[PDB]
Design a protein around this ligand. Structure first.
Ligand code: HEM
Ligand SMILES: CC(C)c1ccc2c(c1)CC[C@H]1[C@](C)(C(=O)N[C@@H](Cc3c[nH]c4ccccc34)C(=O)O)CCC[C@]21C
Length: 455
């Protein structure tokens, strides 16, 4: 039976647009989904989209014969500096399939054996930082996790050291990247963007793009000028040929790929580690089980690749953090042809869908009544999970190319943190989720008491 779609409250001629005039739009859309259910229409002047929250409908949205990746307005604003890199390109652009074919082997689970030593380099810098704190001191969790994830992708990506553990103020490239990302996100709720009042924003945005291009173009030119073969993605991109076209990536597209990886490794991955540690300190029995696994498995001064693979419970902790607060919380699709969603909702070719991942991950028909509880054991038997119920890394050929990298890095770092320190929630931290490009537990702080185990 063809059904009328619910719609949240309207503001006359502005329709639903003012609902996203908020500093926590994902959390606002989750509350709307709680009220309206598995699908709702969102209208603004000149656009309509449909927000999906149920596994029943998202399993159909994930059918690549019926739906392809759409560039949200968010991605279109980020494309002004990420260009036709993998994340901000349409599936039909030549540079998407070329870069996908060239880079897939560099991002495989087996490729992680080659990045492992570099990931350990940065993970040891984090452990040494925390070992060197004085008794009276605390840890700023998202800040240190971001130092770690940014430095890991810089070193594994391009053999470039941001040296984030040597700094209070970000590296100048990172101040320009963060300010460009903040401008991109700010433009989503900026009425009259061509008001001369925004001339200062536009000048600054162009300066920040120039800072990013200048450093990345220099690193690519320097690498071509040296002939050096390294264990990094830049070597793979300079040498690689697409088997289909037989072509390599050009230097401009390589720059966009590097900027794309640095955005990804600065945002989503540090939020995963921040939320994982938040949930562990709030659930001491889970923390104890994870710490027991780390002590049993990590028997050497630094972890081996194989030891990280044997941190099964730590991997379940990470999946359970991704379930509750996935740090890339939505993605957009368009209908390839006219189609009916869920036997109830007719769509025309081109019609857009948004997948609200945190709400999908709270579908009680999948996870049961205890959906708000942090219970990593939910992931003990993943064959029991119905199709498309768990989507923190997106869908199909447009799924996260970085998934294996992100999870290897996070499992290694969290394993070492649990081996080396006991943790205290010394402030009884009240979760406050700040929304930018990503989600983070803003102001999350802990104390770490060394177990005095040498590296
Ligand atoms: C916990 C960490 C991460 C999460 C939750 C995450 C999540 C996602 C999601 C949901 C998408 C699909 C976006 C869409 O459909 O519009 C995506 C795409 C992508 N991610 Fe990640 N990501 C993570 C880490 C990384 C890392 C570390 C890298 C690279 C080093 C990376 C690179 C990418 C790229 C290049 C794409 C585009 C892939 C394509 O369309 O060909 N991500 N990610
Ligand atoms: C770049 C990646 C990492 C990213 C980051 C944040 C968001 C996305 C993706 C995609 C989804 C997006 C939200 C939830 C979203 O639905 N937006 C939609 C709808 C929309 C909101 N205001 C607009 C102004 C003009 C045109 C469209 C829009 C959209 O962006 O089209 C808005 C906040 C940022 C967020 C989480």
């Amino acid at each position: 039976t063809i059904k009328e779609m619910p719609q949240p409250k309207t503001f006359g001629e502005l329709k639903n647009l003012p609902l996203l005039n908020t500093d926590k739009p994902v959390q606002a859309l989750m509350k709307i989904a709680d009220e309206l259910g598995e699908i709702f229409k969102f209208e603004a002047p000149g656009r309509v989209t449909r927000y999906l929250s149920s596994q029943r409908l998202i399993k159909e949205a994930c059918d690549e014969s019926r739906f392809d990746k759409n560039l949200s307005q968010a991605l279109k604003f980020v494309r002004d500096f990420a260009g036709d890199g993998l994340f901000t390109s349409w599936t039909h652009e030549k540079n998407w399939k070329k870069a996908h074919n060239i880079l897939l082997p560099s991002f495989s689970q087996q490729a992680m054996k080659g990045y492992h030593a570099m990931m350990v380099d940065i993970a040891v810098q984090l452990v040494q930082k925390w070992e060197r704190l004085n008794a009276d001191e605390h840890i700023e969790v998202p800040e240190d996790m971001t130092r770690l994830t940014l430095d890991t992708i810089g070193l594994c990506g391009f053999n470039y050291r941001f040296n984030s553990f040597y700094r209070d103020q970000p590296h100048p490239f990172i101040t320009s990247m963060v300010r460009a990302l903040d401008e991109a996100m700010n433009k989503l709720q900026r009425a009259n963007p061509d008001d001369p009042a925004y001339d200062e924003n536009k000048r600054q945005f162009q300066e920040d793009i120039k800072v990013m291009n200048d450093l990345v173009d220099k690193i690519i030119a320097d690498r071509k000028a040296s002939g050096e073969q390294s264990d990094d993605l830049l070597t793979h991109m300079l040498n690689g040929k697409d088997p289909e076209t037989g072509e390599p990536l050009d230097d401009e597209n390589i720059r966009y790929q590097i900027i794309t990886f640095l955005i990804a490794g600065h945002e989503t991955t540090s939020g995963l580690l921040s939320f994982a540690l938040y949930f562990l300190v709030k659930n001491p029995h889970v923390l104890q089980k994870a710490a027991e696994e780390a002590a049993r498995v990590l028997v050497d001064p630094v972890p081996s690749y194989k030891q990280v693979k044997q941190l099964k419970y730590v991997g379940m902790v990470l999946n359970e953090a991704l379930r509750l607060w996935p740090t890339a919380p939505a993605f957009s699709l368009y209908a390839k042809e006219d189609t009916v969603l869920g036997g109830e909702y007719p769509l025309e070719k081109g019609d857009e869908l948004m997948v609200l991942i945190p709400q999908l991950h709270r579908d009680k028909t999948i996870w049961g009544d205890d959906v708000e509880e942090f219970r990593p054991e939910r992931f003990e038997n993943p064959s029991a999970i119905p199709q498309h119920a768990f989507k923190p890394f997106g869908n199909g050929q447009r799924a996260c190319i970085g998934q294996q990298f992100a999870l290897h890095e996070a499992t290694l770092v969290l394993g070492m943190m649990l081996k080396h320190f006991d943790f205290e929630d010394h402030t009884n931290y009240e979760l406050d989720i700040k929304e930018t490009l990503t989600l983070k537990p803003e102001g999350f702080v802990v104390k770490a008491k060394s177990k005095k185990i040498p590296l």
